[PDB]
Design an enzyme around this catalytic site. Structure first.
Site, PDB file in Angstrom:
ATOM      1  N   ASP A  35       0.817  -1.208   0.000  1.00  0.00           N
ATOM      2  CA  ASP A  35       0.000   0.000   0.000  1.00  0.00           C
ATOM      3  C   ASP A  35       0.852   1.259   0.000  1.00  0.00           C
ATOM      4  O   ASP A  35       1.325   1.689   1.053  1.00  0.00           O
ATOM      5  CB  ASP A  35      -0.914  -0.041   1.228  1.00  0.00           C
ATOM      6  CG  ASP A  35      -1.847   1.149   1.323  1.00  0.00           C
ATOM      7  OD1 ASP A  35      -1.926   1.933   0.353  1.00  0.00           O
ATOM      8  OD2 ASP A  35      -2.523   1.266   2.376  1.00  0.00           O
ATOM      9  N   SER A 199      -0.483  15.435 -12.237  1.00  0.00           N
ATOM     10  CA  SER A 199      -0.716  15.040 -13.609  1.00  0.00           C
ATOM     11  C   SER A 199      -0.947  16.285 -14.453  1.00  0.00           C
ATOM     12  O   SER A 199      -1.481  17.291 -13.981  1.00  0.00           O
ATOM     13  CB  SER A 199      -1.921  14.098 -13.695  1.00  0.00           C
ATOM     14  OG  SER A 199      -2.298  13.844 -15.036  1.00  0.00           O
TER      15      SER A 199
END
Length: 330
Positions: A35, A199
């Site tokens: 994770d 992004s």
């Protein structure tokens, strides 16, 4: 040193991925959920409330000659899906894919919430976010990667998750055969403890690319792709019959649909998520309404590039002095 381990979807939908981890002496192998959005290595154990164990493999520290109770240490964690766990702490030897850390904090669960109990395939979590998020008190502990880093050939790990197929976590090296083209690196902020990056935009299907900054986290421990409501609406508007369902808890779509791809930007590079990666199947057994793999982050407070996004790429978690993230197509 290096390590290399195969990671395997837990079910036919890729709801999560498990990776075998050796703990203790002799080794006890548990299948953990790696994770990159959290920083605790915790396991079902011989200390876990019996009624909360249902099929998981447990760590039994009393059977490990290298286990030592970390005196006075406790831990307690709550995740974004509302699940939680807590307990006490041992140090022990932990190996992943041939890479060994001695003195790793292994957080032994005394209590786990219902969703953990109900998932027999996940024996615990191995956190790979920054150690500043680790919940051990009163002395915060380091992640497996943080402990291994100095010994690694290169201070990196990579995630290469499969679509409906096994994949690989590598530590300490970049497998140049595992991706196509070049790896594009992008800046990371560690301010919130995550592999947080920006992004450069998105496209839906064969549509034009929209240049827009989307701050989010690279999170192998989250199944879906959570993005701003504007982006998510633009995606689902291209699927006839798709709608956001408050009763189901997100966007659903007719199972008869062919889903468009979704592209996200990494610098000037582009990662394409095929439409099929966005199908999470019937909302309930036998239903013709299917759950979408792109969902709104509104009210999460952060965008999450979860498995839906990451499995479309070869992803480098670069833990150099100034961390960065790399993405390649594959």
């Amino acid at each position: 040193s290096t390590g290399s381990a195969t990671t395997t979807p837990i079910d036919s939908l890729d709801d999560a991925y498990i990776t075998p981890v050796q703990i203790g002496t002799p080794a006890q192998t548990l299948n953990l959920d790696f994770d990159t959005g959290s920083s605790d290595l915790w396991v079902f154990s011989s200390e876990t409330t019996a009624s909360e164990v249902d099929g998981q493999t447990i760590y039994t520290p009393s059977k490990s000659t290298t286990a030592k109770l970390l005196s006075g240490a406790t831990w307690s964690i709550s995740y974004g899906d509302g699940s939680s766990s807590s307990g006490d702490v041992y140090t022990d030897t932990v190996s992943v894919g041939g890479l060994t850390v001695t003195g790793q904090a292994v957080e032994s669960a005394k209590k786990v919430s219902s969703s953990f109990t109900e998932d027999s395939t996940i024996d615990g979590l191995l956190g790979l976010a920054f150690s500043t998020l680790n919940t051990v008190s009163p002395t915060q502990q380091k992640t497996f990667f943080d402990n291994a880093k100095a010994s690694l050939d290169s201070p990196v790990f990579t995630a290469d998750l499969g679509y409906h197929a096994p994949g690989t976590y590598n530590f300490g090296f970049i497998d140049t055969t595992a991706y196509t083209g070049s790896i594009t690196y992008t800046a990371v902020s560690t301010k919130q403890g995550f592999w947080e990056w920006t992004s450069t935009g998105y496209a839906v299907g064969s549509g034009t690319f929209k240049s827009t900054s989307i701050d989010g986290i690279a999170d192998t421990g989250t199944t879906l792709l959570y993005l701003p409501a504007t982006v998510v609406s633009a995606y689902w508007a291209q699927v006839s019959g798709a709608k956001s369902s408050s009763s189901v808890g997100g966007y659903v779509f007719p199972c008869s649909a062919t889903l468009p791809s979704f592209t996200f930007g990494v610098g000037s590079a582009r990662i394409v998520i095929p439409g099929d990666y966005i199908d999470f199947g019937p909302i309930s057994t036998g239903s013709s309404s299917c759950f979408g793999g792109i969902q709104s982050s509104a009210g999460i407070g952060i965008n999450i590039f979860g498995d839906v996004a990451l499995k479309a790429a070869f992803v480098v978690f670069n833990g150099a002095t100034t961390p960065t993230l790399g993405f390649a197509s594959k």
